[PDB]
Amino acid sequence: NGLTGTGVLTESNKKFLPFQQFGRDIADTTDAVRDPQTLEILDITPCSF
Amino acid sequence: VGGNYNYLYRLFRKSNLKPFERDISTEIYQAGSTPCNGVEGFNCYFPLQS
Amino acid sequence: VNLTTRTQLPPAYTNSSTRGVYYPDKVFRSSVLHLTQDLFLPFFSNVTWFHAIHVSGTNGIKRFDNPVLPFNDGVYFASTEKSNIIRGWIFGTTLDSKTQSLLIVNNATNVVIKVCEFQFCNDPFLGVYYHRNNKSWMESEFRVYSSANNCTFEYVSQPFLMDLEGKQGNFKNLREFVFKNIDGYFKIYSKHTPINLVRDLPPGFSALEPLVDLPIGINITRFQTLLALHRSYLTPGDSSSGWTAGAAAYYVGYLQPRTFLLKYNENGTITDAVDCSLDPL
Numbered sequence A: 001n002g003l004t005g006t007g008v009l010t011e012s013n014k015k016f017l018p019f020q021q022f023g024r025d026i027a028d029t030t031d032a033v034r035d036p037q038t039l040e041i042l043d044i045t046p047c048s049f
Numbered sequence B: 001v002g003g004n005y006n007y008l009y010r011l012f013r014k015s016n017l018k019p020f021e022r023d024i025s026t027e028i029y030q031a032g033s034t035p036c037n038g039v040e041g042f043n044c045y046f047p048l049q050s
Numbered sequence C: 001v002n003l004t005t006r007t008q009l010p011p012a013y014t015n016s017s018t019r020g021v022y023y024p025d026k027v028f029r030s031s032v033l034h035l036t037q038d039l040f041l042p043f044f045s046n047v048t049w050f051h052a053i054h055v056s057g058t059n060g061i062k063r064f065d066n067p068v069l070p071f072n073d074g075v076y077f078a079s080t081e082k083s084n085i086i087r088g089w090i091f092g093t094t095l096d097s098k099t100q101s102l103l104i105v106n107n108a109t110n111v112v113i114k115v116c117e118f119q120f121c122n123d124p125f126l127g128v129y130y131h132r133n134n135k136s137w138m139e140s141e142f143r144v145y146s147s148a149n150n151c152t153f154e155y156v157s158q159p160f161l162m163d164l165e166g167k168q169g170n171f172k173n174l175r176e177f178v179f180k181n182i183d184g185y186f187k188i189y190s191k192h193t194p195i196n197l198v199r200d201l202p203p204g205f206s207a208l209e210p211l212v213d214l215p216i217g218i219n220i221t222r223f224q225t226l227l228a229l230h231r232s233y234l235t236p237g238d239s240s241s242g243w244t245a246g247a248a249a250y251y252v253g254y255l256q257p258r259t260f261l262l263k264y265n266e267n268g269t270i271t272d273a274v275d276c277s278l279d280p281l
Ligand SMILES: *[C@@H]1O[C@H](CO)[C@@H](O[C@@H]2O[C@H](CO)[C@@H](O)[C@H](O)[C@H]2NC(C)=O)[C@H](O)[C@H]1NC(C)=O
Pocket: C107, C108, C109, C110, C112, C139, C156
């Protein structure tokens, strides 16, 4: 939905309210997102460790 | 060719507007200290103009 | 109709323990303590108490309490009732057809929202009727405004069916709202919880969720409240047509700029808060 980045996508267990699209952590970085087509929650994890 | 006068704008107001607000009132505006009570006259003006 | 047969009693006051917290944005958060600055209802603030009791055994102590109140930077509204007496509000400045105004009301079938130039009456009430030959309740009168012109915004919802029986007992439902007006948007937050109290505002904590943002763009300074009343074979006369009116109460507070600390649960629900300006602790 216009948000760009790089990472690894994985199925998530957290459940969003109907008026929420993505979430942030303490560092204000995006760590979860809802897929526009299949309404499911995915997590984002960095690639370099 | 004769002139189009359908579009209007406001000329006098007591205070400035806040963002994204609208007013469509047509009360008479008073400039002098004499009260108006309607009846446009010497110091009473119709707020809208064309 | 100007509803005669009324007494005159002094107002009543109360406070709000930890009521009035709402979600500040639309972002999901989990296991975090977050600090925000916005318009909030201060803790343990001063709340005015209004009620509508019409006991017929007291020879006229019936009272209705629908006055005009100011609108200073947003209000907090709560209602405790069991017979669906509260119906809506009107917002405006002069309320005399020289300026625009907002109307929200429920008429037992569907809710309507209008930003139109209205000529409001002095006592804008609704009414319900009770028949004896059969056991049923129906609405009969809708006396809110005289005229409507220059009418900009409109919204009517899908129909439903509503119950109008005058239940006896204790209060069952608690309804809370927050109203705000910034940059031409009218913002509403709401939350409904069930209770079993009798005569006071419950103390506790509850977080309010966003409902709608209306693009109305008007000057708002004052507001009233809309109430419904019952009529039956009680010596009619319209202005004093034995109008017994159920039992209900509601509360009003005022918002102010403050700084708060919010606690987000695991599941992104707000469960506690701290008011930074209440006391040094
Ligand atoms: C409650 O209000 C609604 C909204 O005005 C009423 O529904 C409208 O009724 C008029 C008159 O019959 C119709 O012309 C409109 O088309 C209706 N609105 C819609 C969206 O269809 C309704 O009748 C009112 N109910 C009561 C009991 O007063």
